[PDB]
């Protein structure tokens, strides 16, 4: 029974726009990381940077199906995005993160943190695309002086 | 040693306003449930309603410490809010939900569901108090159709 961190949300915009919001880093940087090196494409390695932490990460696009699926791997934890149209209303986005190894008891906190983090990604996505607002959920989860 | 679903977030408003957003259902309903049939007080038995889902839950306020802590029980799962002034930034809010039973792949999907759910509460809280916007995360998490 694979242990999966999961977050899902309806985004009330067309699927081509909601999919592009994860492919084009100039959009993704409105709600998730600080900057990304390039557009996602199948088989490509690239870096995502979180300037407000100390952190960047090289990722590899393992699968990219337009308006349907994104699978990326960190060099073997993986994160899958699935996009389904809800006709007339928008795009239902589902994020699943797998690859947690260890005692289940050491993984419960890791699964908690990943679930909250991808839930933040979707809520920021929604505020950005439906309201034009930068909610700053990623930065404000870990404020200075914490 | 207990399993906790948990979500935390900085809300950039004064602690008294951030605390009151959970005590007054005319405020809480802007980002979480549909309605609540009383203001929270120590020892009160209360119902909260999610009319969009046809669901309602009776809750008991076990502890209410003004601007510091709320502890609610459902008939026994418990949810704790802690509120802490980050003087140079705002109000850091932490939600911890305990009362998961079983220790395997039985509790992990439920701690995931709960972590996602309380993360949505805090992002909606942030959007409502900092931007005055109803993000509608709760209703749009389980859209009818699909």
From TrEMBL, chains A, B:
Source species of the chain: Pseudomonas aeruginosa
Name of protein: Polyketide cyclase
Pfam family for this entry, one: AHSA1
CDD domains membership: SRPBCC_CalC_Aha1-like_8
Family (UniProt): Belongs to the AHA1 family.
Domain of life from the UniProt record: Bacteria
Lineage, uppermost ranks: Bacteria, Pseudomonadati, Pseudomonadota, Gammaproteobacteria, Pseudomonadales
Gene3D superfamilies: 3.30.530.20
Span of domain Activator of Hsp90 ATPase homologue 1/2-like C-terminal: 14-130
InterPro entries for the chain: ASHA1/2-like_C, START-like_dom_sf
